[PDB]
Design an enzyme around this catalytic site. Structure first.
Site, short mmCIF file in Angstrom:
data_model
loop_
_atom_site.label_atom_id
_atom_site.label_comp_id
_atom_site.label_asym_id
_atom_site.label_seq_id
_atom_site.Cartn_x
_atom_site.Cartn_y
_atom_site.Cartn_z
N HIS A 236 88.81 58.95 33.61
CA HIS A 236 89.68 57.86 34.02
C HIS A 236 89.50 56.65 33.10
CE1 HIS A 236 91.79 54.89 36.37
NE2 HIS A 236 90.68 54.28 36.74
N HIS B 1 89.84 53.06 33.16
CA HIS B 1 89.85 52.14 34.29
C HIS B 1 90.59 50.86 33.98
CE1 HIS B 1 87.79 50.21 37.90
NE2 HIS B 1 88.45 49.22 37.31
N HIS C 11 85.32 56.40 32.45
CA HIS C 11 84.26 57.13 33.11
C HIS C 11 84.77 58.45 33.67
CE1 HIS C 11 85.77 55.82 37.13
NE2 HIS C 11 85.91 54.63 36.57
N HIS D 180 85.83 61.01 36.34
CA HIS D 180 86.39 60.87 37.67
C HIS D 180 86.44 62.23 38.36
CE1 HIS D 180 88.22 58.71 40.86
NE2 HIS D 180 88.41 57.64 40.12
N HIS E 144 81.20 46.61 49.73
CA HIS E 144 81.96 47.67 49.09
C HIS E 144 83.01 47.08 48.15
CE1 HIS E 144 80.31 50.60 51.93
NE2 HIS E 144 80.58 49.74 52.90
N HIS F 240 88.78 49.49 44.71
CA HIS F 240 89.54 49.62 43.49
C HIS F 240 90.85 50.34 43.75
CE1 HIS F 240 90.65 50.23 39.43
NE2 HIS F 240 90.37 51.52 39.41
N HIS G 275 93.99 52.10 41.71
CA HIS G 275 94.55 52.65 40.48
C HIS G 275 96.02 52.27 40.31
CE1 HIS G 275 91.48 55.93 39.35
NE2 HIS G 275 90.95 55.27 40.36
N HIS H 180 89.94 53.36 46.48
CA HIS H 180 88.63 53.77 46.96
C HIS H 180 87.57 52.75 46.68
CE1 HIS H 180 87.05 54.79 42.94
NE2 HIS H 180 88.29 55.17 42.70
N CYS H 181 86.45 52.89 47.39
CA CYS H 181 85.25 52.15 47.06
C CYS H 181 84.72 52.64 45.72
CB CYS H 181 84.18 52.32 48.12
SG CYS H 181 82.72 51.34 47.75
N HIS H 182 84.38 51.71 44.84
CA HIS H 182 83.87 52.08 43.51
C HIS H 182 82.36 52.36 43.47
CE1 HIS H 182 84.26 52.94 39.32
NE2 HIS H 182 85.51 52.52 39.30
N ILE H 183 81.70 52.30 44.62
CA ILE H 183 80.36 52.88 44.75
C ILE H 183 80.59 54.39 44.79
CG2 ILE H 183 78.27 53.10 46.14
CD1 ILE H 183 78.87 50.14 47.08
N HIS I 178 79.86 56.65 47.66
CA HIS I 178 80.70 56.45 48.83
C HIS I 178 82.03 57.15 48.68
CE1 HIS I 178 78.35 52.49 49.79
NE2 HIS I 178 77.60 53.57 49.87
N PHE J 5 85.23 57.83 51.03
CA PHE J 5 85.75 56.46 51.18
C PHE J 5 86.94 56.19 50.25
CE2 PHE J 5 83.78 52.00 52.26
CZ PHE J 5 84.65 51.85 53.31
CU LIG Z 1 81.21 51.60 49.27
CU LIG Z 2 86.62 52.87 37.44
CU LIG Z 3 90.64 52.81 38.02
CU LIG Z 4 89.07 55.78 40.94
#
Ligand SMILES: [Cu+2]
Ligand SMILES: [Cu+2]
Ligand SMILES: [Cu+2]
Ligand SMILES: [Cu+2]
Ligand SMILES: *[C@@H]1O[C@H](CO)[C@@H](O[C@@H]2O[C@H](CO)[C@@H](O)[C@H](O)[C@H]2NC(C)=O)[C@H](O)[C@H]1NC(C)=O
Ligand SMILES: *[C@@H]1O[C@H](CO)[C@@H](O)[C@H](O)[C@H]1NC(C)=O
Length: 494
Positions: free
Chosen positions: A63, A65, A108, A110, A392, A395, A397, A447-450, A453, A458
């Site tokens: 991905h 980002h 990164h 995905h 949290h 993010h 997309h 989604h949460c970017h942790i 999670h 998530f």
């Molecule tokens: Cu999270």
């Molecule tokens: Cu990202």
């Molecule tokens: Cu992204």
């Molecule tokens: Cu993502």
């Protein structure tokens, strides 16, 4: 490297803090190579999967980002949303344009939790007529600063809650129980010059409070969006956020500590952990002796303003949009949930479901985790916090969004709130509110970017303009064959 390049994805044993472990790396380095181009470029990023270690997955998907990917939804990266994974011994060409964006981004894996195992790097798109260019002298590979969490345990072998072992700044850092001769990153400056520090969180989990002893900053960019310059002396940066922070090398020639304090794992700076070095030309090659002075002007998100007027979509009252989703963020039965549903990936990528003919909202998979959005409308999402494991950072997309209500802010701002792509949702009592307009047909992850999670559910997919998605996103032959190749793999070769 870039805008046109091969990127080999390889396994290598590395020891960035002295502890050797297997990893998944772009270009055989951690972080991966800096990708660059200019505003308006066509990026042709040929990802070559050479992975052999099943313990970190032999498959991959990347991905990019922060990029809108308008008309190239198939290149966005998320496994089982926008593509099937690339299979080992195969290549896949991400071929996209960036006509209307410039700033600091990253890339990164995905696919599952694979980016934690090392597949992450920075991505900078320079603007030849950058309106902020006269505010600094130096902006190049040497002014990119990545902040990374590093784990001694492989992502898929983690037992219980993942806790980062070491903070790595530009890939270097010391572990609390590791060799103290482990190298520290050095940021080189010359007295009297001004530097555009491009601060990139490539974190799988922790946020970092970033500062430099005896120095301060003017923030000029937030997640790709030019801001009015904001004077700050510390910056809390959540997973996947970026800032450009102009540093004036206006202090006496010497060595100054660069500090990145995580919210979890081993905190503070004993033995030079969580640290790097700002070195002026002419200073001794040595560790700093400087003191962390109190932060008198920490970054607060409500103080950030877009450089250019970016009107808030809809009207200036809660729910004053075409479509409202007040998302319920929860956790139950060992999984994170959005509106009661934990995301698990479908066998057929969401984009392929739509392109193959599934255009009824009720038929898209996974059931309960796909929300259709009509095209050409104003959208408001709320992300009320309180659920465990926070704060949290959420993010979206395919979009930037206006942060009409930040964490810790009560009264919404419908005039001039910052626009960005990762937002801290905060804690109990916060009700982060974001707005955007549906101008980009295709399925987009929220989604949460942790990353732990996301793996635990998530996430939700917004299927934006389902009936415009086919016309908008013509797909290349290599994308068309990804699922056929991937589904033919033996389970041990995924
Ligand atoms: Cu999270
Ligand atoms: Cu990202
Ligand atoms: Cu992204
Ligand atoms: Cu993502
Ligand atoms: C977060 O803010 C939104 C408003 O932006 C709240 O949404 C309202 O919720 C009440 C109670 O459920 C509803 O009766 C209203 O219709 C909602 N307003 C709108 C405009 O949709 C939401 O409840 C807030 N969440 C928390 C936890 O405080
Ligand atoms: C797409 O159009 C079809 C045919 O009119 C309709 O049945 C379906 O509900 C539409 N889907 C969405 C998500 O609007």
């Amino acid at each position: 490297v870039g805008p046109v390049t091969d990127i080999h994805i390889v396994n290598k044993d590395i020891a960035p803090d002295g502890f050797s472990r297997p990893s998944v790396l772009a270009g055989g380095t951690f972080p991966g190579p800096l990708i660059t181009g200019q505003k308006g470029d066509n990026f042709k990023l040929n990802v070559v999967d050479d992975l052999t270690d099943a313990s970190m997955l032999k498959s991959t998907s990347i991905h990019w980002h922060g990029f809108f990917q308008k008309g190239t939804n198939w290149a966005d990266g998320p496994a089982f949303v926008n593509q099937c994974p690339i299979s080992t011994g195969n290549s896949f060409l991400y071929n996209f344009q960036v006509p209307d964006q410039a700033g600091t981004y990253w890339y990164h894996s995905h696919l599952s939790t694979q980016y934690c195992d090392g597949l992450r790097g920075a991505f900078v798109v320079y603007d030849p007529t950058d309106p902020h260019k006269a505010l600094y002298d130096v902006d190049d590979e040497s002014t990119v600063i990545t902040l990374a969490d590093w784990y001694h345990t492989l992502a898929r072998q983690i037992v219980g809650v993942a806790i980062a072992d070491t903070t790595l700044i530009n890939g270097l850092g010391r572990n609390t129980n590791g060799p103290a001769d482990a190298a520290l990153a050095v940021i080189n400056v010359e007295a009297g010059k001004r530097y555009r520090l491009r601060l990139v969180s490539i974190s799988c989990d922790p946020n970092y409070v970033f500062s430099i002893d005896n120095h301060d900053f003017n923030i000029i960019e937030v997640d790709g969006v030019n801001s009015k310059p904001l004077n700050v002396d510390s910056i809390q940066i959540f997973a996947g956020q970026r800032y450009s922070a102009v540093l004036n090398a206006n202090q006496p020639v010497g060595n100054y500590w660069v500090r990145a304090n995580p919210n979890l794992g081993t905190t503070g700076f004993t033995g030079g952990i969580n640290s790097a070095i700002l070195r002026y030309k002419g200073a001794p090659v040595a560790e700093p002796t400087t003191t962390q002075t109190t932060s008198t002007k920490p970054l607060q998100e409500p103080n950030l303003r877009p450089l250019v007027s970016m009107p808030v979509p809809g009207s200036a009252t809660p729910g004053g949009v075409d479509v409202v989703h007040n998302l319920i963020l929860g956790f139950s039965a060992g999984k994170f949930t959005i509106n009661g549903a934990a995301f698990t990936p479908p066998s057929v990528p969401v984009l392929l479901q739509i392109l193959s003919g599934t255009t009824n909202a009720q038929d898209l998979l996974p059931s309960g985790s796909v929300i259709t959005l009509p095209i050409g409308k104003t959208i408001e999402l709320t992300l009320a916090a309180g659920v465990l494991g926070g704060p949290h950072p959420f993010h979206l997309h395919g979009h930037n969004f206006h942060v009409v209500r930040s964490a810790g802010q009560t009264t919404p701002n419908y005039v001039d709130p910052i626009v960005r792509d990762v937002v801290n949702t905060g804690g109990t009592g916060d009700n982060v509110t974001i707005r955007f307009t549906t101008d980009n047909p295709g399925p987009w992850f929220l989604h949460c970017h942790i990353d732990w999670h996301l793996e635990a559910g998530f996430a939700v997919v917004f299927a934006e303009g389902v009936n415009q998605t086919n016309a908008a996103n013509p797909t290349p032959a290599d994308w068309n064959n990804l699922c056929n190749i991937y589904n033919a793999l033996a389970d041990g070769d995924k």
